[PDB]
Amino acid sequence: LNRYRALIVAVLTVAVFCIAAYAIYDLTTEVRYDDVVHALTTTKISSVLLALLFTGLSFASLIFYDQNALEYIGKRLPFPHVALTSFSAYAVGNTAGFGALSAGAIRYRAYTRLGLSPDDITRVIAFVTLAFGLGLASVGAMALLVIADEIGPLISVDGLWLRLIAIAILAALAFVVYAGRNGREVRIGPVAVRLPDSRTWSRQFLVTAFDIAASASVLYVLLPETSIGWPGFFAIYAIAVGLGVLSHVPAGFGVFETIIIAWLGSSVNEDAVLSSLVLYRVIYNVIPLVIAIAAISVAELRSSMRRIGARLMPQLLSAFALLLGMMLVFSSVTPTPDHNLIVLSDYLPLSLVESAHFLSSLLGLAIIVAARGLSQRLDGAWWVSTFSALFALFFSLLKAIAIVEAGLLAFFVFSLVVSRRLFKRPASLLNQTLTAGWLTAIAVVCIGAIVVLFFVYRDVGYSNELWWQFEFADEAPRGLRAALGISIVSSAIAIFSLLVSDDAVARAVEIVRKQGVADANLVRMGDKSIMFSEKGDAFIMYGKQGRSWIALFDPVGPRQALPDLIWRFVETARAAGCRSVFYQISPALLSYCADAGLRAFKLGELAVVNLANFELKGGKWANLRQTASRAVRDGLEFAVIEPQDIPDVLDQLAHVSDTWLADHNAKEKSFSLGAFDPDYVCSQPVGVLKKDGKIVAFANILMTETKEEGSVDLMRFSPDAPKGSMDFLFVQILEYLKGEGFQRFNLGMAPLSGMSRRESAPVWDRVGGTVFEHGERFYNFKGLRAFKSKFHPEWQPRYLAVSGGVSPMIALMDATFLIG
Amino acid sequence: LNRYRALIVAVLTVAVFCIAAYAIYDLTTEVRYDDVVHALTTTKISSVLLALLFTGLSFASLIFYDQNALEYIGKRLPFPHVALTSFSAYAVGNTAGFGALSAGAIRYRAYTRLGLSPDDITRVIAFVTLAFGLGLASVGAMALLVIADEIGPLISVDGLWLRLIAIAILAALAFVVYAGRNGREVRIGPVAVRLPDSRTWSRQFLVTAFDIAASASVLYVLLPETSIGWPGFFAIYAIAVGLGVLSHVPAGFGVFETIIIAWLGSSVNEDAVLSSLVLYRVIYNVIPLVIAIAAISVAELRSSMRRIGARLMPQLLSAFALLLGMMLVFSSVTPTPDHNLIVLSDYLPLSLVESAHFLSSLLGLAIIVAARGLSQRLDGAWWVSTFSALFALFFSLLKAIAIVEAGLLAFFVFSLVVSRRLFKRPASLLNQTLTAGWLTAIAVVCIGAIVVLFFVYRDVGYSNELWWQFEFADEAPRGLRAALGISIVSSAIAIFSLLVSDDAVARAVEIVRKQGVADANLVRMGDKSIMFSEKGDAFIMYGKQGRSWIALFDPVGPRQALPDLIWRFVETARAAGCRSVFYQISPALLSYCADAGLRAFKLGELAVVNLANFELKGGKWANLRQTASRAVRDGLEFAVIEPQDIPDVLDQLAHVSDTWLADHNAKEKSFSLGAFDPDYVCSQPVGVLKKDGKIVAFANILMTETKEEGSVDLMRFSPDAPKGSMDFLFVQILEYLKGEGFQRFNLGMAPLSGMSRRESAPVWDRVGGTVFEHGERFYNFKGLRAFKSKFHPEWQPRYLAVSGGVSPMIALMDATFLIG
Ligand SMILES: CCCCCCCCCCCCCCCC(=O)OC[C@H](COP(=O)(O)OC[C@@H](O)COC(=O)[C@@H](N)CCCCN)OC(=O)CCCCCCCCCCCCCCC
Ligand SMILES: CCCCCCCCCCCCCCCC(=O)OC[C@H](COP(=O)(O)OC[C@@H](O)COC(=O)[C@@H](N)CCCCN)OC(=O)CCCCCCCCCCCCCCC
Ligand SMILES: CCCCCCCCCCCCCCCC(=O)OC[C@H](COP(=O)(O)OC[C@@H](O)COC(=O)[C@@H](N)CCCCN)OC(=O)CCCCCCCCCCCCCCC
Ligand SMILES: CCCCCCCCCCCCCCCCCC(=O)O[C@@H](COC(=O)CCCCCCCCCCCCCCC)COP(=O)(O)OC[C@H](O)CO
Ligand SMILES: CCCCCCCCCCCCCCCCCC(=O)O[C@@H](COC(=O)CCCCCCCCCCCCCCC)COP(=O)(O)OC[C@H](O)CO
């Protein structure tokens, strides 16, 4: 199932949007586009201003969503930063909720820039998401319970049934809250939700209820004085928003309008409802994006607001470009007023006007294609989107008057040229499998355009001669040609999207010795494809598995050459149509990974012992001294074999490794743990534990010339060894490394402690459990966490960075299979 | 103004109730009592069961009111105790909200039994009261904001005006919340409200909103399928409840019904609204009292629930008796069905039936008179109420069938005889000025009966021959005679309610020496009236001022003889028509004061130095050793003068006292501080500080034979003394007392520290400020708090107990005037 999870969820989303579009088309048979436009023109200025006010109130409540999340996890951040990240995250989530533009992605980027651990960012995202979903369910259930007899008749449903649905929902929520009184993680199968204390989720319930009330008030004020009061439309709006977010359609664009049109058909004229929905979409979705984009652009023109806005601009501009191209496509489909048509006919040629219409349509589709590249800071995407926006500005001033269209396009161009510096990546737009979410957006825009064409020109029949009509008489030929062009080019886009050595290892080892990370010596295994930097200074060892390029530890090389290497690895993985995965990265590289659109997830702690402060003849290692002394009394001796004179000992090294592999029912792992390749083990010094002449324990010592850090990859123990062989081998290797001039020693990886997992996300479902399972499977081959704690090391968190907003499940499983 | 505050507030409450009653009478001109009864009989059983369910839900939310208050102050109490005290407090507050039956009084009694400090009880009461009031204002304002256009037309008011009222209220509340972000006590003139943190008041807002929703749902379900939805009636109900609680009428009995009748006149037939209001009053007010009373009675029949219910039973029974007598009066006014009338005529004599009607009316009035005595655990009140209830049971089975009336009366008798033990006090019902609140209740019941008579027999004219009609034809003669009897007897009740030595001091001093409280020696001043115990073992020194018998320190004498003395003092003060006040009582007597209906308020801390652990040659008194040594180097010497050889030194004792009184611009206080009476000072040993032959400082040493504790009353310092005379005199007296065999020494009283006042009530208005002002005025004549802290004493809180639920302002001011 998860082999095609993205494809199946995208197909289901497009199918649900198709059902919604058909429902709107069927429910608006008596509504004509002229009636919709007349309702739009007759809307009161008071209504629009009051809708703007309630949009502002809703987004303030969203700011407090994020504020409450940060307060719950304990972190304190300055209010301008939290307000800006919350406003941007919600302005993009309410518009484009798929992978790179989800509110979670915005929050991760901004909070990583703001100085939050990935666990803290995950906790904030989980708190906010569970808050919105659960509070929306609760508020909708209470509103439905209140007014089932007032809004039930509108859809010819008895109020008792809606009341019972609301009661069932409220009973489920009450059972969840009561079963999760004080901690006490309740499991509903895969998910394991741990609700906050009553005070926190109570304040969050006020925040979420006020948010939903303000948004419903936006749309209600934009409605033309209906018969149902505010509570009625509020429950209707809560149900519609719940269904829209549950359908995974971007912004719920189909389902929300479908539900509201289907519901208010009897109460309000559907042309007025459609005009109100159009104006609500415009205000509540475009105006926040325009406000955020303009604020950041002005801050760039003229403190820390500038830096956080620079971090957030690529995604805000990607969302705005998606909306802008959607606008261009829809405006191509919808007809120009006759007055504007005759005005342009008085000045412009016919062929120029028709070509401008078709090109504006195709340029809108090109803009929503290049929006993904804008989200990735692509220089080519900046050029394509800038020129497409400028040409569409001109072609909208030509194919019509398009005052607001031209204003929006010019504002996009302004914000795009003001933020030029942020788009410098050299990857190519047309060399990438786009996304399940991005093809979902393309398909939604295209099908919406087709349905809008069928709705606008429903009265006019489909004549085969309508294709070639040109003489300004009607834009049905123009709309039909634009829709055909959109369909063809989008199908082309979808079709296009769905259609080692020895010197490398040598240079990698040269780089490894030139730097100070001992674990980089795993490149010698030869099973990792090596990706070198542009200068060759740094490299990224990686292995390909499934649909992911699972990179190993941090890019190895000079410090300043690492961010560009991370960017280049991610872009190259996308070029091969794969999602880049960084396995076991240090916290130092999280910000650079975050810029590359990679979200990190903690999967263990790397035990580091500082050899400068390690003196075994001290009180901090009493159990260690006892175990070492008893091992000495058992007859074990430790020697360091140089890599050149190994093989005569390598033969029974293979013997002891095979015996230890037989002793514990485990296979030979790779790509992250020691694999007994005779050349690999020969290439490095091997600390070996010898007893009674024969050797019973050995451990590949990982070293670097700079002597910043040393480590051990694999160690094996024959049953002839005593129980303290592990402790004695570690102590001897650590002492040898300290004597030789090493600052720190890497004990390896350990799974996260239970106390660390206690402060976990409110709504994480399987990520924590699968991280724990992976840690148990792979990190216990070199001593348990208690054993490594016996050395009193400096625990360093290690993270798993995944790309494209994909789930940690699939990347973690791909890494698990690559190791196994 | 405060000289007659109780009278003016009672008169205003009765006037507001009269306006409300006239409004109901004017709004129900077209409604006949037969229509009301028909609507009552035709109510659906489903409606009644669902109203019971929502009453239960509302009272659960009230339990959580008190739970949230206790959580906010930090105290943890077992849930059964909190639930029982909250249920009882709200069942009585929703019915009889005046002095002895307010929810605050119930909470103080129960929480004192549960082990809460009076400051903690004050904080809980303030949190709960501010929660209800502020949350009701907020929820009503939001509901009105939502539906001003849906409920505005019902009273012919434009929705814009109700919306603007709601917006003004919400703006005021938002300004208060924002101005009180983190602590930051906001002052609105007299009051100083410090809102809790957002999480606490958010959970409390959910609790209060659910409470109001459940109560509004009770009444809405009891309504007959109106045209306005639940939000409409909910805002109407919130406004009605706000006005009812704001009018101080018991249970809002007039104003709530007035508002709802006036509002729903157009939507619903007013006979149906009146029936719904009657049934809502019955359910939501009687059923909780019946439930609590029955639960406690069963617990008495068959663990700690029994003890807390025994504590709460007198007040629950007083509230139930008030409702029961109200029922009896109303049933006397309202007519019996003709079928029951002919059934009783078939078996009973005419004169017996008419006498039973009149006597049932007068017995209901007698029951609501004896309810106050029941609240005071009076044995005579138990007898009067029991016999009145039994005779009214029989007279209701005689004057009518009265199945529910007889059931309620029999249940009252059952609960009254089951809880017989609790009513043992020997005071007299008819020897007390009743209360402003109790005359308010009497007047409300009487005026309601008069208006119900005018409403039932509005169609029938007022014929002078209606007085003497007797032959079962109609109960208009019976109702008119009963109403006249009620009016006459209530006027009689209101008219009736509004219409030292040397051997005593000798016996008081004998008791003082026989016990171990040194401060009891203030009785020797002779200005305190002395009230001895029945055996004469113990006494209460007290002084009368204003309308209060301001008792001094704890009753002096044997430990077990004190509770009865406290009870007897309170009862005697009520007999003289005065509110007993206990000044500076120890925490040990709070529970006994709480049983006597006295609520304590902390007014300072009494500094106690344990002489057993006091060794001046230790590090704990370095500043003391330095000051004593410097005073010695200044030439001051300390001597102890026995009480018999004083006067030769008393002459310049008067000299030095006069000089010190002149030095500090203060007068000669009394009743709590040292007054220079030559006999008084002669009667006790006087530690005197002599320098260069003359004496410059002296201090009346207060002693007891049992040597449990010693103290000092007044000390004076001529300007010839140095700055350390106070310290040296205290140190010398303390050392002398320790040597003579005293366990502890009383430094005196100090005002509360600022840190102590930081954990103050959310909504206390003037009590804290006036307590601080009184402490500053009176407790700084013997060294400041820092000075007394230089001795490192054991701070003991001292409380001010006031009676009858009167405000601490007036009792504290009376004490201030008595001292000055
Ligand atoms: C009736 C419900 C009972 C159970 C039904 C089935 C259960 C299945 C459980 C599925 C779990 C999650 C699935 C995918 C959710 C997801 O992937 O997202 C997470 C989202 C936060 O998302 P996010 O935090 O990122 O952003 C939020 C904002 O931006 C997006 O809203 C917009 O689009 C804006 N345009 C409008 C908002 C305006 C506010 N200013 O939370 C959720 O799970 C949502 C769950 C909601 C559940 C349905 C609510 C039903 C209403 C109650 C009435 C019931 C009556 C039913 C009768 C038919
Ligand atoms: C299932 C799918 C089918 C659809 C169902 C949904 C129902 C509706 C939902 C909302 C759709 C709206 C989209 C349409 C936008 C568009 O067609 O634009 C055109 C307009 C003006 O354009 P134009 O300038 O050319 O008109 C000329 C004028 O200005 C000059 O006339 C004057 O001034 C007057 N004096 C003359 C009066 C003459 C009278 N005869 O744009 C706007 O409304 C504002 C710009 C914002 C548009 C962006 C919309 C995107 C929001 C959607 C969010 C969902 C996100 C999903 C992502 C996948
Ligand atoms: C519109 C308001 C704005 C300002 C108006 C004037 C301000 C004056 C301020 C006066 C301060 C206090 C005065 C005396 C209050 C008092 O002495 O008491 C304290 C009580 C808790 O009392 P308590 O805790 O003891 O018990 C509670 C329960 O038992 C009693 O309720 C019952 O009787 C039950 N039968 C029914 C309850 C069912 C629940 N289960 O809180 C308060 O201050 C109350 C203040 C309320 C303010 C008015 C609310 C207005 C609604 C908003 C809509 C406005 C529209 C206006 C249009 C005209
Ligand atoms: C992450 C966000 C999640 C938001 C979820 C919102 C869900 C709201 C609707 C469901 C609420 C069901 C509550 C039913 C009671 C269950 C028992 C219970 O919860 O007991 C808790 C206490 O229960 C409550 O206090 C409940 C308060 C709310 C009561 C229900 C209100 C529902 C909403 C009513 C709105 C009505 C409005 C009408 C007028 C507009 C125990 O609390 P604790 O000990 O965990 O608290 C620890 C403390 O915080 C530490 O400081
Ligand atoms: C003692 C009980 C008092 C109850 C009072 C209830 C009043 C509710 C109505 C008025 C609310 C006005 C709030 C306006 C915002 C003012 C700014 C503000 O309050 O900032 C605070 C934060 O503001 C908020 O979070 C406000 C949350 C609620 C937002 C407003 C909701 C109003 C109710 C809407 C219901 C809508 C329902 C419609 C559908 C039914 C700061 O909090 P803090 O730092 O003091 O918190 C400390 C923390 O708790 C320590 O742990």
Residue numbers in the entry:
A (entry chain A), B (entry chain B): 24 to 325, 334 to 530, 540 to 860
What do the study's own words say?
As a large family of membrane proteins crucial for bacterial physiology and virulence, the Multiple Peptide Resistance Factors (MprFs) utilize two separate domains to synthesize and translocate aminoacyl phospholipids to the outer leaflets of bacterial membranes. The function of MprFs enables Staphylococcus aureus and other pathogenic bacteria to acquire resistance to daptomycin and cationic antimicrobial peptides. Here we present cryo-electron microscopy structures of MprF homodimer from Rhizobium tropici (RtMprF) at two different states in complex with lysyl-phosphatidylglycerol (LysPG). RtMprF contains a membrane-embedded lipid-flippase domain with two deep cavities opening toward the inner and outer leaflets of the membrane respectively.
The cryo-EM map of RtMprF(GDN)-nanodiscs exhibits well-defined features allowing construction of a structural model with ∼94.4% amino acid residues of the full-length RtMprF protein and identification of four lipid molecules per monomer. Strikingly, one LysPG molecule each (LysPG1 and LysPG2) is trapped in Cavities C and P of the RtMprF(GDN)-nanodisc structure. The LysPG1 molecule in Cavity C has the characteristic hook-shaped polar head group inserted deeply toward the center of Subdomain 1, while the hydrophobic fatty-acyl chains of LysPG1 extend outwardly to the inner leaflet of lipid bilayer. Unlike LysPG1, LysPG2 located in Cavity P has an extended conformation. Its head group is positioned on the periplasmic surface and both fatty-acyl chains extend deep into the cavity toward the center of Subdomain 1. The backbone glycerol-3-phosphate group of LysPG2 may bind to adjacent residues through hydrogen bonds, whereas the fatty-acyl chains form van der Waals and hydrophobic interactions with nearby residues including Arg304, Phe276, and several other hydrophobic residues. Such a well-resolved lipid feature found in Cavity P is only present in RtMprF(GDN)-nanodisc but not in RtMprF(DDM)-nanodisc. By superposing them, it is apparent that TM12 moves 2.2 Å closer to TM11 and TM14 moves 4.2 Å closer to TM9 upon binding of LysPG2 in Cavity P. Besides, the amino acid residues involved in binding the fatty-acyl chains of LysPG2 are also adjusted slightly. In comparison, the LysPG:protein stoichiometry of the RtMprF(GDN) sample is ∼2.6, much higher than the LysPG:protein stoichiometry of the RtMprF(DDM) sample. Such difference may account for the strong phospholipid density in Cavity P of RtMprF(GDN)-nanodisc due to higher occupancy of LysPG, consistent with the interpretation of the lipid as LysPG2. A second molecule of LysPG may further enter Cavity C, so that Cavities C and P are both loaded with LysPG as observed in the RtMprF(GDN)-nanodisc structure (State 5).
